[PDB]
Amino acid sequence: WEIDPKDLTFLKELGTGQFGVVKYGKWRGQYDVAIKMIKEGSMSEDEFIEEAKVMMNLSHEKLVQLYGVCTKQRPIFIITEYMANGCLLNYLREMRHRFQTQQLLEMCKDVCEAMEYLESKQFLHRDLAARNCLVNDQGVVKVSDFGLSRYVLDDEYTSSVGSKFPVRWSPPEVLMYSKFSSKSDIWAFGVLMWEIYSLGKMPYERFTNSETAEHIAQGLRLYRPHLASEKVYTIMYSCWHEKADERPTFKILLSNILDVM
Ligand SMILES: Cc1c(NC(=O)c2ccc(C(C)(C)C)cc2)cccc1-c1nc(N)nc(Nc2ccc(C(=O)N3CCOCC3)cc2)n1
């Protein structure tokens, strides 16, 4: 699990996530790393350290790899695979970068691959979204910060009405009852397809977070984004059934992305 700070060089800043300052530099002198400095009072720190064994062990070429942790200090550091294009949500909106329908389904193919893995390792993301995917040199989309939602302290993020919460990505069984399963993950997956195809547009850009939770109750679905065929769309929409038993698996969603390639 544990990593020696002496092996960490800091070179360039990377901005700020939910758990505060994040940097770029070198592990063991050579390798390229993303370093989260976990701001004080932001993380349920104890619970993290204990359970982080199980996150270390998750390995798929489509998940941003957890290389390991520095707990023998404060601030505590998290050490992850450096993705080079940053946030997927931003790679979508760089106004000077046009895409093709196939490039987009490819990104959905990346994301579906990683969540299939998780689904078989029975492990939940809980904050799947374009903003929490990232992109490497060869433009591959990998899934970032899976399971890490569990450990935020900030009622705006934790509490289902809170300003900072993933309303727009969450099914009703979450919005009402905070009831996460593989299927609440699936719901966010389809929302993320919509994200891809709308070139990073705010879903339900019309309504507030609160107004949304209302309308989702009432059976609002996101419409087909302009760049999506009725084929792709029959895929995302399946993500959004009312009853979570009737949402597909990630294994079915992977089959169906091939079916359409
Ligand atoms: C992951 C990441 C955060 N996020 C978080 O810290 C974070 C933590 C937890 C959550 C949950 C879901 C639990 C609430 C959410 C977010 C923030 C900043 C950089 C990074 C980051 N990580 C990794 N692994 N790689 C990069 N790469 C990168 C970042 C910025 C640039 C950049 O400045 N640019 C220049 C041009 O290219 C794009 C933007 C480039 C690469 N950035």
Coordinates of C-alpha atoms and ligand atoms in Angstrom, one line a residue:
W1 CA 0.0 0.0 0.0
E2 CA 2.4 2.7 1.4
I3 CA 4.7 5.1 -0.5
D4 CA 7.8 7.0 0.4
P5 CA 7.5 10.9 0.1
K6 CA 11.2 11.0 -0.6
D7 CA 10.4 9.3 -4.0
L8 CA 8.0 12.1 -4.9
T9 CA 9.0 15.2 -6.8
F10 CA 6.5 18.0 -7.3
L11 CA 7.0 19.9 -10.6
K12 CA 3.7 21.4 -12.0
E13 CA 0.4 22.2 -10.3
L14 CA -2.8 20.4 -11.5
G15 CA -5.5 22.5 -9.8
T16 CA -8.0 21.5 -7.2
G17 CA -10.5 18.6 -6.6
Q18 CA -13.0 17.9 -3.9
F19 CA -10.1 16.9 -1.5
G20 CA -8.1 20.0 -2.2
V21 CA -4.8 20.7 -4.0
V22 CA -3.6 18.2 -6.6
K23 CA -0.1 18.2 -8.3
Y24 CA 2.0 16.6 -10.9
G25 CA 5.5 15.1 -10.6
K26 CA 7.8 12.1 -10.4
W27 CA 7.5 8.8 -8.4
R28 CA 10.7 6.9 -7.6
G29 CA 12.5 9.6 -9.7
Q30 CA 11.2 8.6 -13.2
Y31 CA 7.4 7.7 -13.4
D32 CA 4.6 10.4 -14.1
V33 CA 2.2 11.0 -11.2
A34 CA -0.9 12.8 -10.1
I35 CA -0.6 13.7 -6.3
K36 CA -3.7 14.6 -4.3
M37 CA -2.9 16.5 -1.1
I38 CA -6.0 15.7 1.0
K39 CA -7.0 19.1 2.6
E40 CA -7.8 18.9 6.3
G41 CA -11.4 18.1 7.4
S42 CA -12.4 17.1 3.8
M43 CA -12.0 13.3 4.1
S44 CA -13.3 10.7 6.4
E45 CA -9.5 10.0 6.8
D46 CA -9.5 6.9 9.1
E47 CA -12.1 4.9 7.1
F48 CA -10.1 5.7 3.8
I49 CA -6.7 4.4 5.0
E50 CA -8.3 1.2 6.4
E51 CA -10.3 0.4 3.2
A52 CA -7.8 1.7 0.6
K53 CA -6.2 -1.7 0.4
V54 CA -9.2 -2.8 -1.7
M55 CA -8.8 0.3 -4.1
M56 CA -5.0 -0.3 -4.6
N57 CA -5.9 -3.8 -5.8
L58 CA -8.3 -2.6 -8.5
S59 CA -6.5 -2.9 -11.9
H60 CA -7.8 -2.5 -15.4
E61 CA -6.2 -0.6 -18.3
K62 CA -9.3 1.6 -18.4
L63 CA -9.3 2.8 -14.7
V64 CA -6.8 5.6 -13.6
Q65 CA -4.5 3.5 -11.6
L66 CA -4.0 4.0 -7.8
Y67 CA -0.3 3.7 -7.4
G68 CA -0.5 4.2 -3.6
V69 CA -0.8 6.4 -0.5
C70 CA 1.3 8.5 1.9
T71 CA -0.5 8.2 5.3
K72 CA 2.5 8.8 7.7
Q73 CA 2.0 12.6 7.4
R74 CA -0.6 15.4 7.1
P75 CA -1.7 16.5 4.7
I76 CA -2.2 12.9 3.5
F77 CA -1.2 12.3 -0.2
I78 CA -3.0 10.1 -2.8
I79 CA -0.8 8.8 -5.8
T80 CA -2.4 8.1 -9.2
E81 CA -1.6 7.6 -12.9
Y82 CA -1.2 11.0 -14.6
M83 CA -3.7 11.5 -17.4
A84 CA -2.4 14.1 -19.8
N85 CA -5.5 15.8 -21.2
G86 CA -7.1 16.4 -17.9
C87 CA -10.9 16.2 -17.4
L88 CA -13.0 14.5 -20.1
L89 CA -15.6 17.1 -19.6
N90 CA -13.1 19.7 -20.7
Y91 CA -11.7 17.6 -23.6
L92 CA -15.3 17.6 -24.9
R93 CA -15.6 21.4 -24.8
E94 CA -12.2 22.6 -26.1
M95 CA -14.0 24.6 -28.8
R96 CA -11.0 24.0 -31.2
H97 CA -11.3 20.1 -31.2
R98 CA -14.0 18.5 -33.5
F99 CA -15.0 14.8 -33.0
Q100 CA -16.8 12.1 -35.0
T101 CA -19.7 9.9 -33.9
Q102 CA -17.2 6.9 -33.8
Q103 CA -14.7 8.8 -31.5
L104 CA -17.6 9.4 -29.1
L105 CA -18.9 5.8 -29.0
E106 CA -15.2 5.0 -28.4
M107 CA -15.1 7.1 -25.2
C108 CA -18.4 5.3 -24.1
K109 CA -16.6 2.1 -25.0
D110 CA -13.6 3.0 -22.8
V111 CA -15.9 3.9 -19.8
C112 CA -18.1 0.9 -20.2
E113 CA -15.0 -1.4 -20.1
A114 CA -13.9 -0.1 -16.7
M115 CA -17.4 -0.3 -15.1
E116 CA -17.8 -3.8 -16.4
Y117 CA -14.7 -4.6 -14.3
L118 CA -16.0 -2.9 -11.1
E119 CA -19.4 -4.6 -11.7
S120 CA -17.6 -8.1 -11.5
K121 CA -15.4 -6.9 -8.6
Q122 CA -18.7 -5.7 -7.0
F123 CA -17.3 -2.3 -6.4
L124 CA -19.1 1.1 -6.9
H125 CA -18.0 4.3 -8.4
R126 CA -20.8 6.5 -7.0
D127 CA -19.8 9.7 -8.9
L128 CA -19.4 8.6 -12.5
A129 CA -19.6 11.6 -14.7
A130 CA -17.5 13.4 -17.5
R131 CA -15.9 15.5 -14.8
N132 CA -14.5 12.3 -13.1
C133 CA -13.2 10.7 -16.3
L134 CA -9.8 11.7 -17.7
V135 CA -7.9 11.3 -21.0
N136 CA -4.4 10.0 -21.7
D137 CA -1.9 11.0 -24.6
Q138 CA -3.5 8.5 -27.1
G139 CA -7.0 10.1 -26.3
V140 CA -8.2 7.1 -24.2
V141 CA -10.9 7.8 -21.6
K142 CA -10.3 6.2 -18.2
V143 CA -12.5 6.2 -15.2
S144 CA -11.2 8.3 -12.3
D145 CA -12.0 8.4 -8.5
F146 CA -14.1 5.3 -8.1
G147 CA -15.4 4.7 -4.6
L148 CA -13.8 7.8 -3.4
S149 CA -17.2 9.6 -2.8
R150 CA -17.7 7.5 0.3
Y151 CA -15.0 9.5 2.1
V152 CA -15.9 13.1 1.5
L153 CA -16.8 15.4 4.5
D154 CA -18.9 18.3 3.2
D155 CA -22.6 18.1 3.7
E156 CA -23.1 19.9 0.4
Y157 CA -21.5 16.9 -1.2
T158 CA -22.8 14.0 1.1
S159 CA -26.4 15.1 1.7
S160 CA -28.8 14.4 -1.2
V161 CA -30.2 17.9 -1.3
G162 CA -26.8 19.6 -1.0
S163 CA -25.6 22.1 -3.5
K164 CA -22.5 20.0 -4.5
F165 CA -24.2 16.6 -4.8
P166 CA -24.5 14.7 -8.2
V167 CA -28.3 15.2 -8.5
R168 CA -28.2 15.4 -12.4
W169 CA -26.5 11.9 -12.5
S170 CA -28.5 10.1 -9.8
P171 CA -31.5 7.8 -10.2
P172 CA -34.6 8.4 -8.1
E173 CA -33.8 5.5 -5.7
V174 CA -30.8 7.6 -4.8
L175 CA -32.4 11.1 -4.9
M176 CA -35.1 9.9 -2.5
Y177 CA -33.6 7.1 -0.4
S178 CA -29.8 7.2 -0.9
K179 CA -29.8 3.7 -2.3
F180 CA -26.7 3.0 -4.3
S181 CA -26.2 -0.2 -6.3
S182 CA -24.6 -1.4 -9.5
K183 CA -27.8 0.0 -11.0
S184 CA -27.4 3.5 -9.6
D185 CA -24.0 3.3 -11.3
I186 CA -25.6 2.3 -14.7
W187 CA -27.9 5.4 -14.4
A188 CA -25.0 7.6 -14.2
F189 CA -23.4 5.7 -17.1
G190 CA -26.2 6.6 -19.6
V191 CA -26.2 10.2 -18.3
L192 CA -22.5 10.1 -19.1
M193 CA -23.2 8.9 -22.7
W194 CA -25.5 11.9 -23.0
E195 CA -22.6 14.0 -21.7
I196 CA -20.2 12.6 -24.4
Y197 CA -22.6 13.2 -27.3
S198 CA -23.7 16.7 -26.2
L199 CA -20.1 17.8 -26.2
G200 CA -20.1 18.6 -22.5
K201 CA -23.5 20.3 -22.0
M202 CA -25.2 20.5 -18.5
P203 CA -27.9 17.8 -18.6
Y204 CA -31.4 19.3 -18.0
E205 CA -29.5 22.7 -18.4
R206 CA -32.9 24.3 -18.0
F207 CA -33.7 23.4 -14.3
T208 CA -31.9 23.7 -11.0
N209 CA -30.6 20.7 -9.0
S210 CA -33.9 20.7 -7.0
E211 CA -36.2 21.2 -10.0
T212 CA -34.4 18.2 -11.6
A213 CA -35.1 15.8 -8.7
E214 CA -38.7 16.8 -9.0
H215 CA -38.9 16.2 -12.8
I216 CA -37.0 12.8 -12.7
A217 CA -39.7 11.7 -10.3
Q218 CA -42.3 12.7 -12.9
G219 CA -40.5 10.6 -15.6
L220 CA -38.4 13.2 -17.3
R221 CA -35.7 11.6 -19.5
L222 CA -32.9 13.4 -21.3
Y223 CA -33.6 13.7 -25.1
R224 CA -31.4 12.3 -27.9
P225 CA -28.4 14.6 -28.3
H226 CA -27.9 15.8 -31.8
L227 CA -24.9 13.5 -32.5
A228 CA -26.5 10.3 -31.4
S229 CA -28.3 7.8 -33.6
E230 CA -31.5 6.2 -32.4
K231 CA -29.3 3.1 -32.0
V232 CA -26.9 4.7 -29.5
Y233 CA -29.9 6.4 -27.8
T234 CA -31.8 3.1 -27.3
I235 CA -28.6 2.3 -25.2
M236 CA -28.5 5.3 -23.0
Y237 CA -32.2 5.4 -22.4
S238 CA -32.1 1.7 -21.2
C239 CA -29.9 3.2 -18.4
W240 CA -32.8 5.2 -17.1
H241 CA -35.7 2.8 -16.4
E242 CA -37.7 3.6 -13.2
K243 CA -37.3 0.2 -11.6
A244 CA -33.6 -0.5 -11.1
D245 CA -34.1 -4.3 -11.7
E246 CA -34.9 -3.4 -15.3
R247 CA -31.8 -1.3 -16.0
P248 CA -29.2 -3.4 -17.9
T249 CA -25.8 -4.6 -16.6
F250 CA -22.5 -3.2 -17.7
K251 CA -21.9 -6.6 -19.4
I252 CA -25.0 -6.0 -21.5
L253 CA -24.1 -2.4 -22.2
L254 CA -20.6 -3.5 -23.4
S255 CA -22.2 -6.1 -25.8
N256 CA -24.5 -3.4 -27.1
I257 CA -21.8 -0.9 -27.8
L258 CA -20.1 -3.6 -30.0
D259 CA -23.5 -4.4 -31.7
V260 CA -23.4 -0.8 -32.8
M261 CA -19.7 -0.4 -33.8
Ligands
LIG1 C1 -8.5 13.8 -10.6 C2 -8.1 15.2 -10.5 C3 -8.9 16.1 -9.6 N1 -9.9 15.6 -8.9 C4 -10.0 15.4 -7.7 O1 -9.1 15.7 -6.9 C5 -11.3 14.8 -7.2 C6 -11.4 14.0 -6.1 C7 -12.5 13.3 -5.7 C8 -13.7 13.5 -6.3 C9 -15.0 12.8 -5.9 C10 -15.7 12.0 -6.9 C11 -14.7 11.7 -4.8 C12 -15.9 13.8 -5.2 C13 -13.7 14.3 -7.5 C14 -12.5 14.9 -7.9 C15 -8.5 17.5 -9.6 C16 -7.4 18.0 -10.3 C17 -6.6 17.2 -11.1 C18 -6.9 15.9 -11.3 C19 -6.1 15.1 -12.2 N2 -5.8 13.7 -12.0 C20 -5.1 13.0 -12.9 N3 -4.9 11.7 -12.6 N4 -4.6 13.7 -14.0 C21 -4.8 15.0 -14.2 N5 -4.3 15.6 -15.4 C22 -4.3 16.9 -15.8 C23 -4.9 17.9 -15.0 C24 -4.8 19.3 -15.5 C25 -4.2 19.6 -16.7 C26 -4.2 21.1 -17.1 O2 -3.9 22.0 -16.4 N6 -4.7 21.3 -18.4 C27 -3.8 21.9 -19.5 C28 -4.3 21.4 -20.8 O3 -5.0 20.1 -20.8 C29 -6.1 20.1 -19.9 C30 -6.1 21.1 -18.8 C31 -3.6 18.6 -17.4 C32 -3.6 17.2 -17.0 N7 -5.5 15.7 -13.3

